[PDB]
Structures are given as structure tokens and as C-alpha cells.
Amino acid sequence: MRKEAIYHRPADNFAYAYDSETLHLRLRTKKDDIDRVELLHGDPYDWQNGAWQFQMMPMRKTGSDELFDYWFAEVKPPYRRLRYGFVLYSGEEKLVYTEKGFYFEVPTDDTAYYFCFPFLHRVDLFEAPDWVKDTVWYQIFPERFANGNPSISPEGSRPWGSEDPTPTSFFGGDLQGIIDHLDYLVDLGITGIYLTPIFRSPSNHKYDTADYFEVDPHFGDKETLKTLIDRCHEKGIRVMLDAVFNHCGYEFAPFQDVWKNGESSKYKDWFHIHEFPLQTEPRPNYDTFAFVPQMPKLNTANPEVKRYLLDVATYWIREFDIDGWRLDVANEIDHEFWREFRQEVKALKPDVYILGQIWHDAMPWLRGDQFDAVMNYPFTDGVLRFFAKEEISARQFANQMMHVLHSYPNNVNEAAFNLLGSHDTSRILTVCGGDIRKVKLLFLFQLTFTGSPCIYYGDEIGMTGGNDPECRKCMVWDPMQQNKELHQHVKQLIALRKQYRSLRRGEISFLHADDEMNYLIYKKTDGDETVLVIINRSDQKADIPIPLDARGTWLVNLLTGERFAAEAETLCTSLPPYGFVLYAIEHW
Amino acid sequence: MRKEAIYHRPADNFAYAYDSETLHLRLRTKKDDIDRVELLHGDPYDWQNGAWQFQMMPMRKTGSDELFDYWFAEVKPPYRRLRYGFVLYSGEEKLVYTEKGFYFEVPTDDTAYYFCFPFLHRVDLFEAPDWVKDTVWYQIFPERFANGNPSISPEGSRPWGSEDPTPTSFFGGDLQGIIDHLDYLVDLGITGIYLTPIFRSPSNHKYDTADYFEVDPHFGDKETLKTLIDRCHEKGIRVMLDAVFNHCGYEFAPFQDVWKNGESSKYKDWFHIHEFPLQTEPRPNYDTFAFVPQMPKLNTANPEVKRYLLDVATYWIREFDIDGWRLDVANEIDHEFWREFRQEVKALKPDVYILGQIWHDAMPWLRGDQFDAVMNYPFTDGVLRFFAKEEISARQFANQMMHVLHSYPNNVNEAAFNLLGSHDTSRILTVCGGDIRKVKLLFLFQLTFTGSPCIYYGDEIGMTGGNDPECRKCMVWDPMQQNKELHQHVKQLIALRKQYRSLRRGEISFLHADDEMNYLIYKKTDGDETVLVIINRSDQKADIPIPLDARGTWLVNLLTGERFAAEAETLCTSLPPYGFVLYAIEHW
Numbered sequence A, B: 001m002r003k004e005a006i007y008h009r010p011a012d013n014f015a016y017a018y019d020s021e022t023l024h025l026r027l028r029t030k031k032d033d034i035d036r037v038e039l040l041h042g043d044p045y046d047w048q049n050g051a052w053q054f055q056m057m058p059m060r061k062t063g064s065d066e067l068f069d070y071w072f073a074e075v076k077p078p079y080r081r082l083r084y085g086f087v088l089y090s091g092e093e094k095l096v097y098t099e100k101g102f103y104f105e106v107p108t109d110d111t112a113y114y115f116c117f118p119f120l121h122r123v124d125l126f127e128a129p130d131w132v133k134d135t136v137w138y139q140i141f142p143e144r145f146a147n148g149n150p151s152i153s154p155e156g157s158r159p160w161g162s163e164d165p166t167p168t169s170f171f172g173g174d175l176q177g178i179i180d181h182l183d184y185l186v187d188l189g190i191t192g193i194y195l196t197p198i199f200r201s202p203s204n205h206k207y208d209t210a211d212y213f214e215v216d217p218h219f220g221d222k223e224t225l226k227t228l229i230d231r232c233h234e235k236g237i238r239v240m241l242d243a244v245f246n247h248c249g250y251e252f253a254p255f256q257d258v259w260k261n262g263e264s265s266k267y268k269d270w271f272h273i274h275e276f277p278l279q280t281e282p283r284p285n286y287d288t289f290a291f292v293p294q295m296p297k298l299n300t301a302n303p304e305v306k307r308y309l310l311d312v313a314t315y316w317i318r319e320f321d322i323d324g325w326r327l328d329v330a331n332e333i334d335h336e337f338w339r340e341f342r343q344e345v346k347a348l349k350p351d352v353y354i355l356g357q358i359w360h361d362a363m364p365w366l367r368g369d370q371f372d373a374v375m376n377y378p379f380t381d382g383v384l385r386f387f388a389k390e391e392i393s394a395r396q397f398a399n400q401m402m403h404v405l406h407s408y409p410n411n412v413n414e415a416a417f418n419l420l421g422s423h424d425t426s427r428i429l430t431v432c433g434g435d436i437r438k439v440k441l442l443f444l445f446q447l448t449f450t451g452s453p454c455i456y457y458g459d460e461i462g463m464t465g466g467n468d469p470e471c472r473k474c475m476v477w478d479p480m481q482q483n484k485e486l487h488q489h490v491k492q493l494i495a496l497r498k499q500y501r502s503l504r505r506g507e508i509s510f511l512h513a514d515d516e517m518n519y520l521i522y523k524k525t526d527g528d529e530t531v532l533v534i535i536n537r538s539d540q541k542a543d544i545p546i547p548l549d550a551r552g553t554w555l556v557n558l559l560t561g562e563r564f565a566a567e568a569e570t571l572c573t574s575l576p577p578y579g580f581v582l583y584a585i586e587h588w
Ligand SMILES: OC[C@H]1O[C@H](O[C@H]2[C@H](O)[C@@H](O)[C@@H](OC[C@H]3O[C@H](O)[C@H](O)[C@@H](O)[C@@H]3O)O[C@@H]2CO)[C@H](O)[C@@H](O)[C@@H]1O
Pocket: A205, A207, A208, A244, A289, A292, A295, A328, A329, A330, A357, A358, A359, A423, A424, A468, B044
């Protein structure tokens, strides 16, 4: 029992309101250092004789990362007010952790010793559109999906798929192409399309916005967008658009004016300009995305720039009915803006998925007053290092997955954007060194993990390539090229996910196999149903023992449909190289 | 090194923008475990020759508590963007602490391992009024200060000072009384007056409001309030009113109504009612302050309530130019509401001090989007447990002191409302058990601590009594009965506080004393100023040595005036029981 490692603080991941009456509490201890923990809790004003009235509830260890045990307790305070503490036991030896420090005995003559959650407010409750939890995304890079209309393909467009993607090449893909391949997506199981920037911009990626109210001429038109979205909506698909608000393009109307007028520009305060007139040599004299001259940072602090951006935001929702906004480099925009952004957006269309792009611990942006989710990169890094690269062991993977999960609140975790790759990364199959068997595992872990999974175009058919622009080759539409074992694999898994809530929203726990270096075993539970997953992460066959109690326990193979039961001597599966299996557990 | 004890989370007290180009980073470690710490930092996009240009800035240990060491670092990102990690040294052993975990050597092929502080936006910077940081408040209980206008006292009042008050007694205290005695305060040094509730309320404490827009008649009228405030302004004193928004009183018009027309009431949504019709037996079927039927909880999520309390907030400010609101039981009101509260208030009178009564860690209400400051109860707890009750040791008081301070951002601690007692706690003299010496040590530690200190009426003249109602006696105006020793003592200190910047805005640290059981040596510094204080929390004469490097060292007794130099053998200090001394330190 080492106090040095004990920790809890009343906010974010450690203390939060799950729903209106239930609030969850976490505690963190040294790995294996504690046996059991009990939450001390009671209404702040419940008193009898100079004694505070409390109840004791045991906490359950929900996971462990490299060097910490995480404990969980969910209490529905009688009057929505609560004061709590923790009683730690190490082989019957006890300790008392509170806001005022530790003690051998439980203080009861005042409540200032204890941590406090003053009151459960419905309006503060974190809440992300429920649908996203059941959705399964497919990110599209319009320029390279499908050229469904050549008349508007920019001059120079290379023959589709012909050569390798360069920073300045074009192939003529357009929104019409997407409308032209929607069934394909509807067949895969996709239920949401996330598109990358489409508003008019010089480049092929469109991350350097030219006009936030115009559909890039080469992609199509308002008329064309609407039909895309409506066609998607009738097919049961939601549409997410990308919003590059951190900065604009060199060609942004206002920026041009500041450049050709400088100090006297009607828009000098629209940017982060230090010296006049603007320069670029050696480096820019005005803040930019990184050090890119064509991407001058917008000043979201100016009431105008702010009004404008808020207009753009509501415009598209109000005029096209998109179901969400993906906002890149969002972590670089001030919280004050994001606070409004939500207010306005949510005022218009309540269940709009506001996904901010953040490449690090995003807790400050996931409290309920801003984004609904972020890009779960820790998930990405993890899954790849284990399944694809094979650089970390299974205990390590379980460690990092638990580490990222206990880092946020449960409801925030339920709406996490889980992707294995993107337009800014290498192609998952290329990371797998070309091993399809591995990619199969990624999708497997992806599609059984709680949250909102996203699939990068072509990763389901086996596309390959390095990192940007290499990961942006044209979609592959010829069957003789698109690895079908994967298609059916993905398609198959997407089906299971829709079928099993535990997969979509349940809790995850890792069972210790007799080799935490190549075999990974875990299960998903939403309290009602339970699915079990066993993976053989190695290039050899293996006989794996399923660690389950057999009393009234039945397992169902979700891939073959087969069924059977665990006896007074349960069994052990055995998969081939990179093999796997899913079992629905029944407790009769 | 103890990895499990090392900790850092990019937010709240650990990472925060101090100003518009300077941000603070803080790290936690097991006390004495780490030799040195260095902050590894650099701009997220400054790469050259394929290597991330990052620098190594050494960190400073600003204190420790029971179990930890706290390290500090001040950094100005060249482009207001920053990626960082921490490097720890213990002998030859090296650890690199990052968002992605511990490493035994600086990873450099990426910036993702590192903790991140995206951008420095002025709109996200924390800012409490500055005037507050040089103020010294005096808390008054209008009912017990002075019966300036005996024509409006309530029927039944007792001759001023007749006997010990009761929860229902009245001594006809009024606002005129305050005005009449302003000179007494102007003489003491008071530069800020905080008043408890003054709006219409059947009680003698007025915490159960009847009408937020009416000044209790027995206290005075709108007109009388102006003059008190206008007169206060010319004597250079700020005025702060106490607003009770968490709950109303049984006599509050809207509630009375619900109490007549149940579920049909046009106001049933201004409260937290569980079943209709309302009931108080066996217990109230509606949420109240604690379990007090007379105090119905307002539902600040309701749009009408919300708009109402906001108008009340800006009404008095707007028409009476008050200098700040002390918001009662603020931790039980939703965050969203406080966010409007600040928006509204600040747009009206930016320098309005927004103080919230939160009896526990309040990090969540102090991010700059809600409260400017809260009652620093931890302060009071430590201060009394050591100087008054003599329960904890000096070392303990020290840790407790650092523990709190390090749980908040330097700029937040800069505006803390540091009080020793209220109309809710007993009397400081009564807690010292009569010893005027101990109490005298309290004013000392209070008036040498950073923040905004406050003095309970009478404390400065030796008034006594137990916990509510006993602590709310009638202000002793008889010179034959008030304790003039303390008065001057207090008048003496507030003066030094005024002239010694380092005393109100400086950093604090505890010079390890020999008898780490009864002596306390600490100094205050703001970068230039440097005051040192030595206290003999003992009932015996003590010879206490001064731990200071004496190469160009000049001490200045801020009490006698005497000046002297420090020699190789650090000068020792002789002090009587419970004696004390403050020196000004000059390095030449
Ligand atoms: O300017 C050159 C590149 O611009 C565009 O890159 C986009 C990127 O595609 C988009 O996802 C986003 O990325 C945000 C992150 O960028 C880096 O990875 C930082 O480390 C991280 O802190 C950011 O959050 O924004 C950029 C800029 O618009 C083009 O897509 C890319 O092809 C160009 O090479």
C-alpha cells in the first residue's frame, strides 16, 4: 500500500455524472498494491450526532495499465449531492484516502475531509448524439474516390489510378462519384460518410480554404451536394463534413486584401499579423498552420471572424442537413470559440456530431461544453503497434488500451472516433508489411471496440501505399485488384457489431492468457450481453485456453454459428496463424 | 525513481497560460526521490535536418507536501505553440516522462510522445480583478454592526448588546450603522467591505431571500444603499454584496404560488419539485438547502429563473455600482449558469470581483470562464489547526499550506479570499481558547499570505463566542471592552501589507527550521521584495537560528526599524513565548 501512487480528483475522468441520477467515480492505485477498495459516500448534510451519515460500497478494478490499477464505482446519490472518500485494503490492512489526505480511521466529525460532487446537474451532463455510438464511418477523400463527372475534372487530371499521387496531382474524383458508388458503401455496412474538405480551394486536398460557402467547382455544386446527402439519408447514411477553421488559404478573400493593403486593410485584425506588410521570407511574419505560408491562421478572437465562422457552421447544417462537423487543428482554436460553436450548432440541430481533431489528451475539450469526441489517436497508435508492427506485447497493448480508456469518462469513451488510418498516415495494409492476416485483426479489434469506428477508403479492399501523399491513391474499383477476403471480413464484422450492443457500447476487459506476448484475449460487456474475443497474434498455430467459469455457461461462435457449452472442465480453442474467434457468452 | 509518483496532466494547475506569452508548467514527484528535473520543450512544428528543434530548461522545486515534491517552470513559446515532456535525474539514472509514458532516453523521431499546450489565446487566459490583490476585506453582518437608524429596527429588538443572540434574535442592526462607522474602518486599513445578505428576508441573517430586488426595510432603502456605497467609494473602499442564488425563501413569491396551485403553477419549474402538491412532512418533497424546508432550491436551468438571477446580478451592479458578488453555495449551481453569470457581469463592469463559496477543491469553477475566486477554506483549516488549536506541527502546517497552493495556478492563488473566520465559524479568539497571543499569530500569517484577506467584524478588537449564533454578537463599540492590543496589531500589519508588495502578491516558501516541531520560518518574495517571518508557535522562550546565505545580506526588522548585516554564522533570533518577527531581506 503506497500512498505515493494513490490518486483521485473530482472532475473529468475521475469523477463525473453519467446520466441524470448516476455519477461514476474512479480511483487509481499502484498495480497489485491493493486488494479491494470501498467508496465511502453520503449526502453532505446527513447528520445525526456530530457524525456524518455514510454508506460503504465496494469498488471494482476495471483495468490496469503499465503501472496502475483503476477502480470503478457507480452511485446514484439519494438527493443528487455527495461527499465521498475511499477505504483501501491490502490484505485486511486498511487506509483512508480523502481530499485532506490519508488516515487510519474514518473521520466523521466534519465533511471537509472528503471529496465532493456538490450536485448532479442535467444541463452539465456530458452528452453526444446517441446515434454515433451505433454508427460506423467511412472517410472519403473526394478528389480520389471516383470521377463520376469528367466535365468538371480540372485540366491536367491524370488518368484515374494511372500514376502515383503527388502533392500537386489531380484525378478528377467528385461528389458525383460518391453518389455513383453509394450502394457499394451501403453494401459494406457503412452508415456514415465523413468527407474531407470540399469547399473551394486551389489544392487537391482543400485544406487551404478559398471560400467557406462554396463547393469546390471541380467537386460539384450545392445542387450536387444536396442530392448526395439526401440520397445518403434515404439509404440510412449520415454525412460529416470537414471544417478547416484554424486557418484559411492564401486565396481567402480577406487575407488577399490584407496582403494587398497591409496596415490599412479592413481585415488587419482578422489574422495573427506581427509586422506590416505581410512577408514569407525567411519564414512568415504572421502565425500560420505550422510554418505554411499559404495557410495563415485565422483569429477566432475577433468578433467578426467568429461571426463568420459560426455562420459557415450553421449554414451547411441549416442548408444541407449534414449530421456532423470534423474540425481539424481544433486544439489550436480558443475554448471560448468552441463553447459558442457548440451552443449555436446544437441550438440548430441538437444531434449533430461535433468531432474536433485533437492529437493529444483532449480532456479539456470533452467536458460537455464543446466537442462530443475527438480523433482517438492513442487508440490508433496502440492497435498498430500491436497488431500491425508487432512492436509491443499483448500486456503492453492491454495496458495502453486501458490507459486511454480510464483517461476519459465512460460516456465520452462511448462516442470516440476510432480509425486505424487516414489520409495523413500510411496505409494499414502497408504497415502490416503487406500481411492481410494482420489487417483482418485490426478491423476485428476496431469493430468490437466501444465507440464510433471509421474506415479509410480502400482499406477494406486492400489498398496500399506510404504516408501522404502516398496514402491518397485513387480508389480501386476493379475486382481483380480489390482483395475480397477483406471485404467480406469487414462486411461480416460490421454486421456483428450492429448485432451486439456489448461490442458497440459495452465495457472491455483483458483476460490473462498463458503467454502475454502473442495471444490476446478480451471480452465486451454492456451489463446485458457479453462477447468474448480470442486472437492468435503470431505466425504459428496455437492452442489457446478460454478462461471462463462453466456453471450454466454457454458459448456461441459468431463466425461459424456453431454452439456448445463449458463443462466441469471447459475447453480451449486453437487458431491458425493470426487466427481469431468471437463467442457470445450465455449465463444460464 | 518512483514512476508511479511522478505525475503531470496538461491542464488546470499543471499547465496554464500565465499571461499572453508566458505559460506555466508544473510537475509532481515523490518527496526527495528526484535529484533534478528539466523541462524538455519546443514548437510542435520546428523541424530541421529531420530533427525536432527542442530545448532543455531546468525546473525549480517550488515546494513539497506530505508525500510530494513540486517542480515549476516558466516558458514562453516562440510561436505560442508548445510540445513538452520532463526529464528526471537521480544520480546517473534518467527518466523521460511524456504523455505516452516513461522513456529512458529522449525520443526524438516524433512530437506525439509529448504533452501539448496547443496555443496561447488571450480569451482563454485566467483573469481576476487586479485591485482585489491589494485589498483587505472586512465582513459585516448588517444586523449586528450598528443601529444607525433606530426608527426602522424590527419590533422586539433587544437593547444593543443586551445578551447572547439566538437564531431569531434581533438587535436592529442596519445599513446606516455601517456608514456611521466607516471612519473606524478607514482607520483600521479596510479597503474592501463584504456584506452578508441585505435583501428582504424574514430572518435576522437574511439567507432565505423573499425578494432579490428589495433591500430589507429594517436595513434601509435603495437610497441608503447608494450613499453607503458612494460614501465607501470616496473613502477608497470596495463593496461586495452576498447573493443567494442556490436557494430562495419560503416567502419568495414564486414559491408561495407553487405552494397554492401545485402542478398548474406558472412557477412550478423554478424549483426542484418531485411530487405535487408540495409537502414538508414527513420531509420536503422538493429539493432544499441541506434539509431545510424554509429554503427551496432554485432551478437555474429554467430559462426564466436564469434570466431572473442574471438581472438581479446586473441590477445592483448597474444601479449601485457594487464592486463584486460573493455567491453563496456556488458549487451547487450548474456550470453552464455560472458561465452566463460571468459573461453578463463582466460585460457590465469588468473589474467586478466574482467570489464563490466553495468548501473544497474548486479547480472546476476556476478556469477563467466562471469564478474569479473562492473562499480558501484549506487555508483557514491549516492556519487554525496550527496557530490556534496546536494540533498539527509546523512541518504539517507547511505541507498543508503548499498542498493547497500547488493545487491551483499562481494567478488563481493570487486572488484567493483568505479568511480566518465567518458568521458560520466560531470566533478565532474562542478557538485559541482565549489566548490573545495565538490569535495575534493568526492575523500575522493571514496578513503575510498571498491573496485577498478578510476580517470578521470584531475579530480585530477581541470579540468572542462559539459557533452560530454565538459568533454573531453585537459589535462591541465600548472602548472599555474592546481589545486595543489586537486592534493596533492588526492596524500595524495591514499597513506593512500595503507597503510590502511581496506580502500580497509574492511566492512563499518554508525555511526548514531546526525544531521542525514548534518553529516556523518562511519568506515572501515577488522577484524583488523579500520578507522573512519567524514565529515561535510555543509557550516558551526560544532561540531560533536564521537559515540565510549571508554574502551581501541585510535584514530589516519591519517592526522596530533596526537594520543589521548577516555574518558567516547566520544570526540567531531570540523570541518570547508566541513571539514573532519579520525581516526585510536585501542582497547587495
Ligand atoms: O500544409 C501542408 C499539408 O496541409 C494539409 O494538412 C492538413 C491535414 O491533412 C489535416 O488532417 C490537419 O492536420 C492537423 C494536424 O497536423 C499535424 O499532424 C500536427 O502535428 C497536428 O498538431 C495537427 O492537429 O490539418 C493539416 C493542415 O491543414 C494537407 O492535407 C496535407 O496534405 C499537406 O501536406
